[PDB]
Structures are given as C-alpha cells and as structure tokens.
C-alpha cells in the first residue's frame, strides 16, 4: 500500500515542500556538504586551483 | 518597497538555497489562501439548495 | 535495363568525427535532462503565478539567475549545444567548443551516458533500386509511403525487381490491383493484394502485366538503438527548427525532410553502423535543442 | 580577502544507504529550522529602519 | 447588471440620472443583427438549433450612425443590459445622462422625426416580456413629452392594443405620478433558490439567464472594486 | 465497367474471441499501468543516481528482484502479455494462458476494465468501390491519405460512382483542378476544389471531362469507442514492434501497415462491429508491449 | 500558359473577429487548464472505483453539482467554449456569449493569457503557382507532402516557374530523377535529387527535358507563435471532433482536412498576420474541447 499509492490531486503543501529539498539536496550537493569525487595527489604535483 | 498591491517587497542579502526553498514554500502556502466570498461559493455547492 | 532509386538514399554525406566520447555524451544526456526541467517549470510558472520554479530550472541551466533587464539566452550551456549540434552534421564544421567546457557542464547532474537501453522504430522506406527492362517505365516518390508506379507497353509481361537492402526489418508492399511477387528464382504464386516481406530474404521479382499502372505502395520499420529518454515527436520538431535555424548550413552536405529520411540514408551507406552512433546522439542533442528553445524563445 | 558563505549546517550521507530515503529525513528536518513546516504568511514589513 | 436591478420606476429614473450615455454604448464590433443562425445547445440537443440574432439580445451588435441607432442603443441597454457600436459620438454627448437625453433639449439631439412603430419592430417587441415592454414604454413616453408629441404616444398605443393593457401609468413633468407609482420593473433579481445552472435553448433566455445567475456574486463584489478604482480620481 | 477498391479493405481475417471478459480487460489495464511506471522510472534513476526505483517497479511488474546475470524479461506478466497478442489478432491462434494466472495478474493494480469510456478519431480512408465506365482508368492508391487518379480516354465526359461505406462520418474530397461532384438523383453544382461529404448520404457522382487526369485527395474522420487510457502514438508503435517480433506471423492471415488500417478494416467486415471491441483491446494491449519492451529489451 | 495551385490555399474565408480581447482570451486558457484537470479526475475516479474526484473537478469546471436524473454536459462552461469556437471559425458565426459569462469564467482559475510564449512548427506545402507551357502538363496533389506530376511533350525543354508563399522558412525538393533547379536569373545547376530553398529568395525555375516525367515531392516547415500549453495532438484531434459534431457547419466557408492546412491557408490570405492570432486562439479552444468531450462521452 505504501509502495502502490498514488499522489492526490491536491496534495498538501507539506509534500512538495519536502520533494523540493529533497531534490536540492541531490542536484545541489555542495551546498549541504558532501560530493561525488575527490583526487588525492602527492604535494610536488603542481595543480591549478581556485584562487 | 510596495508592489502594485499592497505587499511589500523585501529585497535583501541572502543565500541561493534559502531563498529558493522559503520562497517556494511561501508559494505553495499561498495557493490555499482564498478570499472568504470564495470560500462561501465553494460551500453553497456542497450544501442543499434551499 | 533501366534504374530507378529512392532519392533520399543517394550519396549521404560524412557525419561529424567530434564529440562522441564518453564524456561528451554524458553532457548531450545532461543537456536533455537541464531541458526538460525547464520546459516543465515553464509550464508551471504560468499556472502557478509564481516564478520560483523557473529561476531555479534557469540558474541550473545558465550559471546566471534570470535578469529583467536582460535577455534569457541560456547562458553557456545553450552556446555549447548550438555548436555541438553544427559538428554532428558535417565532417567539414569546426568543433569550437573546447572539451573543458564540455566537462564542466556535464558535471551539472548525473546521468548515464548509455545510448543502447532501448529502441525507436523509424518508417523510411529503403528502395535501394528497381531494375526495370526495355518499354517499362517506373517511378518511386516518397519516403514515408514509397509509390512505385509502373507501366508497361511492351508485347509480354516484364519482370520488375525490388532490392530493399538488408536493414529494414519487415516491408509491406500494397498493389491498387492484385500482383504477383516471388524471391530471385523462385515460382510466382497467385496474385494478392499484400504482401509481407523480410528485406534480407533477397531482391524480389513482380510480374507486370500489360496495359494497366500498376502503382505498388511500400511501407517500412527499422529498429535503432537509442537511449530511453529519446522521444522521436521531440526530436523531429528538434530537426526542423535546427535547419530553419540553419545551423545545418554547410558547404557539400545532403538535406532531408526528416530525421527518420536522416537516419535512415546514414545506416545504409558504407560504414553506416559507425554513422548511426553519432546520429543518435544528434537526435538526443536536438531533442534537448527543441525544448530549450520552446522555453526560452530567442 | 573576504568572502560571503551560506551556511545551511552539515548533512552527512552515507553511501550504502539509499539518498532518498536520506534526502526525505533531512527534508523534514530542514523544513523545521527554516519555520516553514507550517502554513504560514511572512510579516516582515516591520523591519527597517528611516 | 445595475439597470437591470430597477424594478420600481423611480428606482430606474433615479439610475438613468446617475448614469453616462457612454454604458449605453459599447466598444466591441460586434455582429449583424436580424440574422438567421445555428447554434449549439449540446445540454437538450446533438443538432444545431436554429435562432434568429436581435438588438435586444445580450450581445452588443454593430449599430447605425443616425440618431434612430442611439435611440436604439440606449433601449437595447434598459431592456437587455448591453448597447450597440456606434463609434464616435462625441465627447460632449457621451457625459451627460441618459435621462438628460431623453427628457432634456440642452443636449443638442433632435428626435421629433422618430416613428414609435418603426422603433419598435427594429427591436422585436413581439419577442419581449411584460417587464421589457414597460421599460421601452417609459423611454417613449419621456421621449414624446419632450417634443410635444403626447398625442402621437396615446394614438400610437390605441393602434397597439395589447401594449395599451401594460402601459406606465405617469406623466412626466409630474412629480405625482412618480411616487405612487407600483409598477415592476425587475428583469433581474436576487433569484429563487428553485434556480439552477442550466442553459436555456433561446439566445435571448439563456443570456437573461446568465445575468440572473451571476447577480449574487456582483452584489457581493461590486462595491469595493468600483471604489478601488473610484478613489484618487 | 470497372471496379476499384482499397487494397486494405479486402478479406480481413476473423479476430480473437479470447480473453474479452471483464476479467481479462483488467489484466491489459493493469499491464498497461505497471509498464508506465516502467517507462517512469527510469527517468527517477536518473534524478536520484540510483537504481532502486528501478527495482521497485520491476519486481511489482515481474514478481522478482532484476538480476544482473539475466536479461530483464518481465516475467509472467511478459509471457502472459506477449500471448494474449497472439490471441487477439487470429482465431487460429491459441488461447494457451489460463483464467488462473490472468486472475492473479489483474489484481496487482485497481482498474476498471471498462473500454467504452472516451473515443478516438482513425484517420483511414475507406473506399468500398469505385464504379467506371468503359474507357477510363482509375486508380486507387493510399490509406491515410487516398490518391485517386482518373483518366477518361472517351469521346465524351463519363460519370464515375464513389462509395464511400456507412461507417465512417466525414470525408473531404480535394482535387487537382476543380470538378463537380453531387449525390444520386440530384443537380450538379459548378466545379469547385473542396467538397465535404457524409457517407451515409449515399453514393457520389463525379464528372470527369476528357482531357488531362483528375486527381482527388481524400480523407476521412472515424470516432471508435475506447478507453481513457488509450493513445495513439503510442499504439502505433505497439503494433510495428509486435509485427517486427513475429506476433502476428500465423497462417492464413492478413497484414496491414498501421493500426489505422487494421481497426478500419475489421470495422467494415461483415458483422464488424464485433471485431471493434476486440481490436480496441488489442490496442491498449500493445501500448503495454510497447512501453514494456523499450524498457527491457530482449 | 497554364496555371496550377494547391486546392487548400485557394479562397481562405474570413474568420471571427470577436472574443479576442485579453479577457476572452484568459476564457480559453481557463477552459484547457479545468479541461485538463476533468480529463485526470475521471481517470482516478474509475482506478478508484469512486466518484469523488470526478465530482470535485466537474463542479470546478460547471460550477454544478453532477445529479443522477440529468445529463453531465459540461455546463454553461461548455456552452460558451462550443459557441466561441464557432465565432473563431467564420465570421457568418454570430457572437451570442454575453460579456459577462466570459468574465464569470475567466475568474474560476489564475492563468496568463499569452498565446505568443512558445512557437510551433507546421508541416503544410504551400504551392501558390505554378506556371507551365503550352506544351506541358502539371499536376499537384497533397497538402503535407506535396507531389508534382509534370509531362513535356514538346519538342525543346521546357522552363516551368514554381512560386512558394512568401511565410514559409524552408522548403525541400526531391525528385524521382535528377533535374535543375536554380533562382530566377541564375546559372542552371547540375541535376541533383534534392534542393534545400528559401521561398522568400524569388521564383525558381525548374528544366523538363522531353521524355519520361519528372515527380518532385515538396515539405515545408514554417514557425507560428503559440501557447506554452500548446499541444499539437490533442489540437488536431479537437479540430476533426468539432467538423464530425457540425460546429464548423456554417453558410460560405471553406472546410480542411486538419488544422495545418487551416493555420497555413489563413496565413497566405491578404491581412494573413491579423488572421493567424485569431487560429491559434481556435487551436486552444480545440484543444480544450477535444479533452472535455473525452472526458464527458456521448454515445
């Protein structure tokens, strides 16, 4: 039953509140503190970076 | 600063994602804030006719 | 011995050699996804009378929230798929677009970059060729709906042979009269009005008689492999605005009706299982083309 | 230097479990600190300053 | 919506003071008029249903640049809410009353030449109700006494035998006449609850049907969104 | 005198009398309600990077976890689905799908069976016969849009009798050059491109003067009882993929290009209005074997 | 000479001229937006087996209560939408919708009433004229794919103009022999399949050499404004809906086999830009028609 229900028409607002930061929180990663890459590198390599 | 109604316009220094967020549940809060002359003809359909 | 042929099967040009990488398809795949959002934010925003789901699908999209005074081009993303799509079509156009930027952006979401999870069915007909004897005349016209119209005014009945290629899947040949059709040396049956047929079967000989038109009406389906996303209602709307657009403007480059009449004359030509890769991702990049564009009206 | 952060506190995620299933609990959460849980209205013309 | 709120004669009197010549006259183009047309009427039949278009329907029609078409105009407005296109009349015109047009010679129009007979059949009085038939009685009889015609009105009503039965009983000039009147006048009122949102066959029924159902809501509404836009005039 | 007729309308085959009850008609809407999620989760994969989703709408439609050794085949619901194809279109085939497991099938979902709900318009010409006089040609080629070609080589102008049948409602005939075109027993009016008809009116005379051939384009407007769920574009490619993956090859049977053609055509059978039902059925059937297939591909 | 023209392009009969202002045009929107919402709700209410949802949006959408003993019609809500449609299609069609229903029904919902948000692509041919010599014969047929069946049986080759309408963006050419096609004044090119023109460039002249006939097979694509909400399927079904039930049925007005040939034909006419706001407004009333009968049957 949980799995089969169907959205109402005129669900309440609390609902799509909650899909909207759900789905900040996937598209928009950074702002919430966690990515999907990182590079570990030794220190003599010199790497361009944000300055 | 007034809008061409009488709300007023807040107009601040504030973060990407919680503008987004606040203000899109303002949005939705509001589509189920009606009139009362609404409300009532929205009540005299599920009511008898007399 | 006469030669007649489907006009958009003759001489398909060379299709772009640039950005069919791994990480460029994921971009092209990005792209549709970031479009697609902002197509249906579009619609929301209207209904709803509030702008915030738009700014948000336009911010994701262009880098840069939304302006009034300003016009909503679509920031760099719009500028890199308007390129890509020019270097898909030819081999001769530049490839601008630098493959930072195209890293960059594809970073904006996660998507598979997989271009053969599922299928579309495309109805161009692929008459390669009708070998017609002396006194027959013979006409092909459409693409969608081959017409073959045939006339004899010889003594005897004259044999006609169909070569459909080998990549369509099934061809159904519908006469205005009943016809006979067999394989190459094979016994003709009785005549009948419908007639399903395997293209790879071989090339098929039809017994004309004389006095008559015998008008024969050819329909096709091929199966492609194309992402699941792929909408193909999205993608000719894609096509037609490219070319109106005319960022298919190129020197020496053939010009088609449709996507399918695309598609179709690429896998039939030499090398074609390599050319069709690239057109789907094209199909993919003018279907994200099509729904940025409706949105964003520039 | 100087520099402007948002700061919306920290949100780990673990890799095994599903991100939506985790996604929804911050949701809930998230829409409690921000007040927006609730239907509500923003009175907030009061606060300037002439 | 307003007009066809009146049901007592001074009550209509009294509006028609307050009232410009410009809501008696409408900007849309409009249609022809006298008209033989099908329409849907889906609720009772799958066939179109045959009409005939009039001045006196709802809808405001393309009208005449002569004085007989602003007459008509003003008529159409009392019986039938709505007014015809008559373009350019003239800023002076337009602002005063429509009682000072049909009752006051300052106005500048001449309307002596006006046959009752052939007014009356460009606006189908065989198709109008009781209550429609007093209301164009009334403009004609402040329309006869300004010009001095109080004979041709009494004659014209001999002729016409039934319109003689409903005919208003006052005078004008007198102020007598108008207090005691006791006529009904009221095409449209607060409706009994026995109504229902349902399509009448007739162009003419359905739209006196549509502004039966929405005057209850106009009641509610109409006094603050004129005083919205009345203010800091 | 010579008879013309469209090449689709001739002896169409005896539909399927199985699986038309109310219980089998909810099997097919559940079918066709569990393949949309389907389709649909795979566009929540991607927003979520994450294949439970998936998982979810696979396992309620096959009644197992997706394994990554095998290919996704649907399960029983897929066998059951493919099977009751076969059925629809020829009596020959079998019904081999017992009552029990589509019992169980249709009650994974809560729907209404009830395909009478809404309507559809199908858009293929019929053109029973057309009835010439001696010394003249006509031609009739085309289903969609019907092309027919009129030559007269007489001495004088000849009268040439379109039939039309009873069932379709509209039909607009335009042609080349401008011609006359009037019911039996009634005047002739003066020549004009564009004539709207009604086939129940009854057959139709055309003028056709000697000289250079007349060609007139038809097109017809059928409205068919359906069910809401019902859409065309997506039937349509149903029907290609069903054809495609040897559905329909069973013996002594007819082939048509397009559903249109197929639904018309049972329609103008003798006691055809038995066959509507179940073409309609069959249609809702292969919009889930479409939707099905693209996502899992075999 | 002769002369030969497409048979949808010929005589375009005027269309209404009224309920186009910004409030009737916020009618129509309303109308497809609450049209949508009923098409959904009688979907839910028969998963449901429960009338509760079709109810709800029904007495949105007619402002009335569904009763056992009378006919779910639509309402005075369908009443307007069947009668407007009517006016938008000839101006023979009277306007018999009061001004104050369509302000009663624009109300009911909160909708933007621009139709030029969006674009849409149409696929019908125009072929205005085309001009043979004595000696040739030139037949077309077909609005989507126009064919152009043309014979030479004199002695030298013959010059035949082919004249596109000036509105259409692009146009291709493919012939089932090659032949030359080149711009009026120009060098005669190589003879190739296909031709990608311009109609706006000028008149083209094509080459017949005397033998076998030549077919050349025309599609067109041209762009027109329209609605966000704009929705080329269920447009086209609500414009052969409304020929099949006689709402198009009106004295002196010319009848097309779908909405494209419509747009097209109305665009080609003198006033052509004036005429074509006046059929996209048509198309979305079409497209609001067509869901609320699907969701309302009538057997």
């Known amino acids: 039953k949980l799995v089969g229900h169907n959205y109402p028409v005129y669900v309440e607002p609390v609902v799509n509140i909650m899909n909207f930061i759900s789905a900040r929180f996937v598209a928009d990663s950074s702002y919430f503190g966690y990515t999907n890459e990182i590079m570990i590198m030794p220190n003599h390599i010199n790497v361009p970076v944000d300055d | 600063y007034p809008d061409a109604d009488g709300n007023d316009v807040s107009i601040i220094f504030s973060g990407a994602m919680s503008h987004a967020i606040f203000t899109y549940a303002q949005s939705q809060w509001n589509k189920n804030i009606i009139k009362l002359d609404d409300y009532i003809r929205e009540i005299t359909l599920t009511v008898p006719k007399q | ?298 | 230097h100087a520099l402007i952060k948002e700061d919306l506190g920290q949100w780990p995620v673990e890799t095994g479990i599903s991100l939506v299933n985790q996604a929804g609990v911050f949701a809930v959460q998230l829409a409690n600190k921000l007040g927006i849980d609730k239907p509500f209205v923003l009175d907030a013309g009061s606060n300037y300053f002439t | 919506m307003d007009v066809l709120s009146k049901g007592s004669l001074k009550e209509l009197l009294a509006h028609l003071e307050k009232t410009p010549l410009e809501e008696a006259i409408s900007y849309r183009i409009g249609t022809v008029p006298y008209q033989n047309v099908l329409i849907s009427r889906n609720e009772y039949y799958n066939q179109l249903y045959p009409d005939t278009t009039s001045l006196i329907d709802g809808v405001s029609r393309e009208g005449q640049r002569n004085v007989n078409g602003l007459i008509m105009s003003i008529i159409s407005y009392v019986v039938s809410g709505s007014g015809h296109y008559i373009p350019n009349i003239g800023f002076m015109l337009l602002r005063r009353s429509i009682l000072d047009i049909l009752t006051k010679h300052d106005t500048g129009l001449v309307t002596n030449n006006l046959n009752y007979g052939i007014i009356a059949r460009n606006l189908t009085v065989s198709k109008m109700n009781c209550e429609q038939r007093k209301r164009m009685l009334i403009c004609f009889k402040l329309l006869a006494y300004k010009d001095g015609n109080q004979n041709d009105y009494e004659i014209y009503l001999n002729q016409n035998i039934p319109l003689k039965q409903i005919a208003p009983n006052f005078i004008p000039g007198d102020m007598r006449t108008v207090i005691h009147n006791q006529d009904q006048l009221a095409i449209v009122g607060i409706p009994a609850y026995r109504l229902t949102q349902s399509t009448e066959l007739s162009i003419r029924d359905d739209n006196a049907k549509s502004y039966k159902l929405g005057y209850v809501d106009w009641y509610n509404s109409n006094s603050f969104l004129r005083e919205r836009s009345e203010f800091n005039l």
């Open chain 3, 1 to 298: 011995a006469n030669r007649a042929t489907s006009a958009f099967l003759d001489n398909p040009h060379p299709v772009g050699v640039n950005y069919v990488d791994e990480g460029s398809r994921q971009f092209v795949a990005v792209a549709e996804l970031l479009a697609s959002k902002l197509i249906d934010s579009s619609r929301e925003s209207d209904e709803s009378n509030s702008d915030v789901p738009f700014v948000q699908a336009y911010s994701k999209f262009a880098d840069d929230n939304p302006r009034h005074l300003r016009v909503k081009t679509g920031g760099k993303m719009a500028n890199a798929l308007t390129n890509v799509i020019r270097s898909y079509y030819s081999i001769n156009a530049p490839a601008i677009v630098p493959q930072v930027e195209i890293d960059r952006l594809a970073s904006k979401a996660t998507v598979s970059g997989d271009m053969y999870n599922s299928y579309a069915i495309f109805n161009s007909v692929p008459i390669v060729e009708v070998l017609s004897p002396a006194r027959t005349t013979v006409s092909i016209v459409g693409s969608d709906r081959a017409d073959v119209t045939m006339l004899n005014t010889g003594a005897g009945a004259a044999n006609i042979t169909f070569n459909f290629g080998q990549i369509a899947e099934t061809v159904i040949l519908k006469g205005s009269v009943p016809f006979q059709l067999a394989r190459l040396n094979q016994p003709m049956p009785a005549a009948r009005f419908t007639y399903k047929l395997r293209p790879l079967d071989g090339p098929f000989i039809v017994v004309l008689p004389v006095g008559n038109p015998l008008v024969i009406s050819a329909t096709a389906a091929t199966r492609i492999q194309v992402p699941l996303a792929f909408n193909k209602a999205l993608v000719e709307s894609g096509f037609q605005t490219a070319m109106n657009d005319g960022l298919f403007d190129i020197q020496n480059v053939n010009y088609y009706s449709s996507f399918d009449e695309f598609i179709i004359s690429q896998y039939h030509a030499q090398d074609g299982i390599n050319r069709v890769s690239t057109c789907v991702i094209l199909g993919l990049a003018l279907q994200a083309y099509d729904q940025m564009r409706r949105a964003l009206p520039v």
